[PDB]
Ligand binder design. Structure first.
Ligand SMILES: CC[C@H](C)CN(C[C@@H](O)[C@H](Cc1ccccc1)NC(=O)O[C@H]1CO[C@H]2OCC[C@H]21)S(=O)(=O)c1ccc([C@H](C)O)cc1
Lengths: 99, 99
């Protein structure tokens, strides 16, 4: 589809058997999701943006479905105020910017 | 143009007569630029990102050309990690997400 940007580009995602709302965010290299207790091993990481850094847990090869489109890749889990779908997954669903 | 996301969507902008590089950021409501000199009056404002809140200078009705497309809108100036073009200006140049 085509999503205009009058409002935040929020979409439903499925990850770890849960449905959630997340931003399609061309400004994020990677994907960052609200605290959730995923199984498996993880690696600590610190990521920075406006206001400074937050601590997150890096999970690799996680299955995620973004508005019907399947993808698999790294997800960072931590105290983010919004779920952020980054370019690592936006490429996998064929998402582009156009003007 | 159509912009894929395997790389950061960085474009050249012109603001205040000077060229800069900026990131097309669909996850940003607002446009925030690193510290710079801009003519005209400004108002102190607060903005929140992934890591907390920062103080910025708000410039309204500022001419800014993005990848050859003209916009006139609000530009926030402050200690953002990188120059980001937010939805307030992406809508003006007709930018949409497509997949
Ligand atoms: C570096 C360029 C960007 C700043 C990077 N960010 C993406 C960016 O879209 C954030 C998303 C966001 C964050 C909090 C609340 C809403 C939306 N928007 C944002 O800050 O917008 C500001 C201005 O407009 C307002 O609207 C929303 C907030 C205000 S990040 O989240 O910090 C980030 C850093 C590192 C990684 C890993 C390492 O790749 C992934 C993501």
């Amino acid at each position: 589809p085509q999503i205009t940007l009058w409002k935040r580009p929020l979409v439903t995602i499925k990850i770890g058997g849960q449905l959630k709302e997340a931003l399609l965010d061309t400004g994020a290299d990677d994907t960052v999701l609200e605290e959730m207790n995923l199984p498996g091993r993880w690696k600590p990481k610190m990521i920075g943006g406006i206001g400074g850094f937050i601590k997150v847990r890096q999970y690799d090869q996680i299955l995620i479905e973004i508005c019907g489109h399947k993808a698999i890749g790294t997800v960072l889990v931590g105290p983010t105020p919004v779920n952020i779908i980054g370019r690592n997954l936006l490429t996998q669903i064929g998402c582009t910017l156009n003007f």
